[PDB]
């Protein structure tokens, strides 16, 4: 409906032709900048656009801390976790845990858990975001949009558009950043510039605030007005929607799982030619992670300014007519800005950019999940599996998880307040912190053994489920309709719960490990951070040596370290600037 003009159809078709042509033409080596671009492209998908813009429209600046916190955890990956992964000679994170602790249950459990996390927070989220973009562009329902997105994804995979070339994610990162820059320029032009956004945001509210539902009736000002601390990154510890202690500590835990314990990102970073290239790509990715504040969040705030009756709908029936979700319609923030603000031709370009972000993230996720199932689940049951059956099983597993994610999609649309990023980060905060705790204790506390690790993972799963299940079962509330969560189980912010779950999992891990037999030191050479440069042979629980070498020349190591310090100082300045 909105891309029905010849210019939009032409630009979309040109992008599809280029993608199909490059995919059909396809018929440890990466240097630092491909590594950084790959990390950024794998991380940033259409879910990031939808969620960051929606939370910026709904709440303001603080959501940028979800991307700005990633600089420090990417430096953790480059300087603490990547060395250990490279010296351990691992291809999957469950494989590292298998080397570190032994046994076969931690690897299997972590594979299954990671696949569930990909279905929940990664695949279904991206499918939902693409469907929302198709809804705004074509005026379709959510299910026609999902079917269309599945069809185009099937075309992408059949034509081979998800194949990984040497500089594919570099081009994807360039296209994402260029499209986001064009839309950011148009959006800032609409509001009268950078200062126009901050002039206008706090006054932008919908004029439709009375509901015909007698239970709702007059909706309070607190529910439709922009938050008073909308321009502040650091918000109140108990009343803030993103309290600063939770945004700085629990978000560090969740981001640490995301960047240092997760196959999607680590599989990209482990392709670096050297450790200096991995560290420099970490610096580049961290610098690129400062961009979603101005390319996603502030455009979402501008979207609230421009379309307050749609993006900031408060009345449940008005919201149901706007986006189909009665609890809020902020997810259409970036979609609407693409279709209502971009002119003919550039609107199709922005749709192509969103599809490119979606497809780069999906390529990373599909590769990682197929690898996980193939090497950590399937090959355990079929050790004699040939390459052909492994490849076929991987493709079929990818198809299976895509179907399962589409099945899960109703939960994703039932995000709390109708905010996708809240759903992503809450599920991450309920399921990830046990993995963060176990990976940290594995890397840095050699006394932790297989018993402590596995039972910390299981106990963390139990304690995080005692939060996840009531959160979903009680339904999706909003400010207008708050839902019947007991408010001791859901009143606490999910990043505070990430802190609590991380510390409870670490405590259970340490306590079970200290009550059982320790792992002898000879089994932990080059597996713990304490023994990266250990040259002894280890009892596992030429070319390979060059694969497992993390010795870097002092000059470029010093240059990379100084650039990491400079990037941290720039990030700290930005944190203070918007504090």
């Amino acid at each position: 409906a909105l891309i029905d003009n010849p210019a939009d159809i032409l630009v979309i078709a040109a992008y599809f032709l280029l993608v199909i042509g490059v995919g059909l033409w396809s018929m440890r080596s990466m240097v630092w900048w491909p590594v950084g671009a790959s990390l950024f492209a794998s991380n940033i998908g259409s879910g990031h656009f939808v969620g960051l813009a929606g939370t910026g429209a709904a709440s303001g600046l603080a959501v940028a801390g979800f991307e700005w916190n990633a600089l420090f955890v990417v430096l953790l990956l480059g300087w603490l976790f990547a060395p250990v992964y490279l010296t351990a000679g691992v291809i999957t994170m469950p494989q590292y845990l298998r080397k570190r602790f032994g046994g076969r249950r931690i690897r299997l459990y972590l594979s299954v858990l990671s696949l569930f996390l990909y279905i929940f927070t990664k695949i279904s989220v991206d499918m939902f975001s693409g469907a929302v973009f198709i809804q705004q562009a074509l005026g379709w329902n959510i299910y026609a949009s999902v079917i269309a997105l599945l069809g185009i994804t099937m075309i992408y995979t059949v034509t081979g558009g998800l194949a990984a070339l040497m500089y594919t994610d570099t081009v994807q990162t360039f296209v994402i950043l260029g499209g986001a820059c064009i839309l950011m320029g148009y959006a800032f032009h609409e509001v009268g510039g950078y200062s126009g956004l901050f002039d206008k945001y706090l006054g932008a509210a919908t004029s439709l605030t009375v509901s015909e539902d007698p239970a709702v009736g007059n909706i309070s000002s607190f529910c439709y007005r922009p938050r008073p601390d909308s321009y502040h990154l650091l918000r109140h510890p108990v009343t803030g929607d993103l309290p600063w202690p939770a945004l700085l500590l629990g978000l560090t835990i969740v981001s640490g799982w995301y960047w240092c314990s997760d196959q999607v990102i680590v599989q990209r970073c482990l392709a670096g030619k050297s450790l200096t290239h991995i560290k420099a790509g970490c610096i580049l990715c961290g610098y690129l992670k400062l961009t979603p504040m101005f390319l996603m969040v502030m455009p979402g705030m501008i979207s609230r300014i421009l379309y307050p009756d749609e993006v900031a709908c408060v009345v449940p029936e008005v919201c149901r007519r706007v986006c189909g979700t009665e609890v809020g319609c902020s997810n259409i923030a970036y979609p609407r800005l693409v279709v209502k603000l971009m002119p003919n031709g550039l609107r199709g370009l922005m749709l192509a950019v969103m599809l490119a972000a979606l497809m780069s993230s999906l390529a990373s996720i599909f590769n990682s999940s197929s690898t996980l199932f193939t090497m950590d689940i399937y090959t355990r049951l079929r050790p004699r599996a040939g390459d052909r059956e492994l490849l076929l099983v991987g493709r079929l597993w990818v198809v299976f998880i895509v179907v399962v994610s589409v099945a899960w999609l109703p939960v994703v649309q039932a995000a709390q307040g109708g905010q996708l990023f809240d759903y992503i980060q809450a599920v991450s905060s309920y399921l990830a912190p046990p993995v963060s705790a176990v990976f940290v204790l594995a890397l840095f506390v050699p006394r932790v053994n297989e018993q402590g690790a596995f039972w910390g993972l299981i106990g963390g799963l139990l304690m995080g489920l005692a939060r996840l299940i009531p959160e979903f079962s009680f339904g999706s509330g909003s400010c207008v309709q708050p839902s019947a969560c007991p408010a001791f189980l859901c009143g606490v912010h999910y990043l505070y719960f990430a802190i609590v779950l991380f510390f409870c999992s670490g405590l259970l891990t340490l306590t079970v490990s200290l009550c059982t037999a320790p792992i002898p030191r000879k089994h932990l050479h080059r597996l713990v951070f304490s023994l990266r440069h250990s040259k002894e042979e280890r009892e596992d629980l030429a070319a390979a040596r060059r694969l497992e070498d993390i010795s870097e020349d002092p000059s470029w190591a010093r240059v990379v370290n100084l650039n990491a310090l400079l990037m941290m100082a720039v990030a700290v300045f930005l944190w203070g600037f918007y504090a």
Binding site: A569, V572, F573, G576, F577
Partner: peptide, 30 residues
């Protein structure tokens, strides 16, 4: 109050002080 650039510079000063502290810890007793 403080301008946002003044707050940023205060944050950078705190970061550099912490960097010096971490370097001293690294140099003296690992």
């Amino acid at each position: 109050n403080l301008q946002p650039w003044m707050q940023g510079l205060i944050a950078v000063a705190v970061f550099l002080v912490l960097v010096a502290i971490a370097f001293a810890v690294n140099h003296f007793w690992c």
